[PDB]
């Protein structure tokens, strides 16, 4: 065809991701194999651009086939996380990587684009100490299966509560919730709420920042899934949840782990928290 496959990165919800060249360019890109309303909408992506989105390149509509072609980054957070896991991943650098991620997310909802499914393989690295949001706007587009392509299981990791007690139309709320659990998780070295099902997950959120009631979320008794037989677990303190955590970083998760949606802090408020005034852009030190 043209492209020349280097390899294959990973698989995911939707399909398969090749490494591969542009034979005509000689551009190195990411190519998504996937498997209509959704062509509109996810042409549309190509629009989007910001430099803390990876670029959406071009859209391939052939033979009851969806190819993405995307902007190749060279690594994922979840693989940094990992390979940074003895020592951690320097607060400087955590600093860093939660302002741009949040620069990005205010670019998008500004735009009225929800990510939907914002998780550590969901964000791409580079030498330069950049960090990009990956797949964003593609869960409004082909919805979220329960399963993935290749049989693996969905990631319940990030889910905001609102979403898991079935509120239909939820908000751009459900991304600072991920991006705090992402945070929260680069500082601790483990993940908050690694949940192995909904419920799992849901009580696990519970267990953790209490049970929430309608003196703390209005409304939300009479959420869709809501059951009235919910445990009633009390809260814990942020200092127990993220220790390490100077009270600046606390205060910022807190506010991104509100219950209540609407007052969950927005992307554009939480980049003039105090937490990032002494923001820098420190290089990783990335093997490749
Ligand atoms: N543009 C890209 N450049 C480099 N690697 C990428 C790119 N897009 C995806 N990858 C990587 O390829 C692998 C497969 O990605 P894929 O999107 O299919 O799965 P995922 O991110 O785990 O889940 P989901 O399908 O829900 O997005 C992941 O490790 C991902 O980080
Ligand atoms: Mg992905």
């Known amino acids: 065809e043209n492209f020349q496959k280097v390899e294959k990165i990973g698989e995911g919800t939707y399909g398969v991701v090749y490494k591969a060249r542009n034979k005509l360019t000689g551009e190195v890109v990411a190519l998504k194999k996937i498997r209509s309303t959704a062509i509109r909408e996810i042409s549309l992506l190509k629009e989007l651009n910001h430099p803390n989105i990876v670029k959406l390149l071009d859209v391939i509509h052939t033979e009851n086939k969806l190819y993405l072609v995307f902007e ?22 955590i600093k860093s990587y939660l302002f741009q991620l949040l620069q990005g997310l205010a670019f998008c909802h500004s735009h009225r684009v929800l990510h939907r499914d914002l998780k550590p393989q969901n964000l791409l690295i580079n030498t330069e100490g950049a960090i990009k949001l990956a797949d964003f706007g593609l869960a409004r587009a082909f919805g979220v ?26 908000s751009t709320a459900v991304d600072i919730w991920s991006l705090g659990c992402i945070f929260a998780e680069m500082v601790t070295r483990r993940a908050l709420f690694p949940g192995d099902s909904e419920i799992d997950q849901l009580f696990r959120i519970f267990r953790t920042l209490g049970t929430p009631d309608e003196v703390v979320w209005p409304g939300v008794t009479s959420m869709p899934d809501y059951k009235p037989s919910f445990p009633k677990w009390a809260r814990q303190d942020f200092s127990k949840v993220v220790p390490p ?24 408020a939480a980049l003039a928290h105090p937490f990032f005034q002494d923001v820098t852009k420190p290089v990783p030190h990335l093997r490749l």
Request: overall charge positive; aromatic content about 12%; glycine content about 4%.
């Open 72 to 93: 190749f980054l060279h690594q994922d957070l979840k693989k940094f996380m990992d390979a940074s896991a003895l020592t951690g991943i320097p607060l400087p650098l």
């Open 145 to 170: 299966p329960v399963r993935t392509y290749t049989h693996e299981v969905v990631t319940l990791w990030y889910r905001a509560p609102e979403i898991l007690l079935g509120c239909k139309y939820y």
């Open 245 to 268: 955590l100077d009270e600046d970083g606390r205060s910022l998760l807190s506010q991104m782990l509100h219950y209540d949606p609407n007052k969950r802090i927005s992307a554009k």
